[PDB]
Ligand SMILES: Cc1ccc(C)c(OCCCC(C)(C)C(=O)O)c1
Ligand SMILES: Cc1ccc(C)c(OCCCC(C)(C)C(=O)O)c1
């Protein structure tokens with residue numbers, strides 16, 4: 001699994017379950033092309049977005065749909081979503097974990113990048 | 117001031133100085149139109165972005181050019197830039213402070229929304 | 233002002249108002265001795281804690297009574313309190329800002345250390 | 349595993365490896381008694397601190413030795429350590445994950461609490 005996303009909830013002290021995630025890759029014409037999407041499991045984790053073959057060099061945007069997550073829980077949050085934009089695989093294939101920690105008026109993100 | 121941006125550096129323990137910040141407003145056709153921009157001051161702050169009359173309800177995106185910031189300090193960064201995407205809502209308090217805390221592989225953002 | 237504390241609320245998107253803050257200095261016998269304390273203002277800030285003459289090099293601990301803060305808002309919190317433990321060093325810049333961002337199961341803190 | 353600790357590094361985009369962790373439990377006399385300690389693995393994780401039997405009701409302090417971690421990498425950090433202080437197992441046994449994200453002048457912590 002070359003790209004994985006994990007999301008925690010800072011209000012409940014739990015995984016953030018059923019969070020929609022959309023990944024885009026910047027195209028030659030500088031627009032964002034849809035690349036992969038899915039939703040986090042009971043453990044807050046989203047596996048299986050892509051494959052080593054398809055996950056080529058590029059600029060990627062991981063959009064985490066925080067608003068829909070909070071509204072589904074009955075909360076009115078500040079942000080529309082949380083974005084993480086980065087160049088990937090520029091020095092050969094790596095494995096990326098994108099982690100986010102959510103609050104209604106705040107979020108944090110970090111990346112773990114490892115070499116297989 | 118209806119909209120203020122403040123950026124801090126978690127590696128140096130300082131304001132993030134001379135960081136470029138672009139604000140966009142979402143247009144009816146869902147494209148992002150330029151709205152305001154500037155560079156953070158010696159205190160990491162960017163004031164004067166807009167006025168009450170110009171800052172109407174809507175979806176806004178604040179793009180912080182973190183990559184240039186780190187490169188100017190000789191640090192290899194992960195992100196292309198940081199985004200903060202939010203709805204401005206007249207019901208709520210009048211003044212928005214968007215704060216961001218920068219690290220090379222991570223970032224945190226929060227909103228401080230208050231009445232004078 | 234050589235030492236300032238600022239506290240924000242990630243659930244409400246506001247300053248954290250009326251939060252008790254205790255500062256301790258580490259004594260030669262490794263116990264923590266009271267040094268200064270106060271309550272955050274309506275802007276989430278606590279000024280006037282100490283003076284240049286009193287704030288000598290050493291190890292300090294800033295305790296923020298997060299549990300009382302959340303309970304006063306009717307929110308069930310995880311932590312007993314938040315701590316920030318650091319060395320004051322005269323080599324470095326003169327002014328220390330300790331900032332904390334509070335959620336019920338999480339918190340973030342950073343230091344902004346600058347010269348006037 | 350009723351108590352686990354995970355630590356990431358925001359500068360390197362990696363697990364924080366070989367981080368010393370000390371856990372204390374508040375005693376009847378209000379002093380902090382040593383409870384368990386260990387260090388994070390190659391994956392940034394610390395398992396095996398305690399057992400369901402020994403991990404009784406109490407106020408616990410998880411001290412993460414961030415200074416020793418950064419100094420071992422040649423960096424002079426701001427904080428002495430990162431503390432997480434909380435009441436545990438007050439409503440029966442739970443499983444706690446304590447996560448931290450480290451930068452030289454900043455850290456973040458969150459907790460995941462689950463019911464077995
Ligand atoms: C303290 C903090 C700040 C910011 C973020 C994004 C955090 O993310 C959760 C990391 C979870 C992890 C370690 C990847 C895991 O579950 O194995 C944590
Ligand atoms: C601990 C932490 C984590 C993440 C962020 C974004 C933080 O914001 C900095 C707040 C600075 C403030 C209060 C807006 C000011 O200087 O006026 C703080």
Ligand code: NA
Nearest residue numbers: 089090091092
């Ligand atoms: Na290349």
Ligand code: NA
Nearest residue numbers: 437438439440
């Ligand atoms: Na009980």
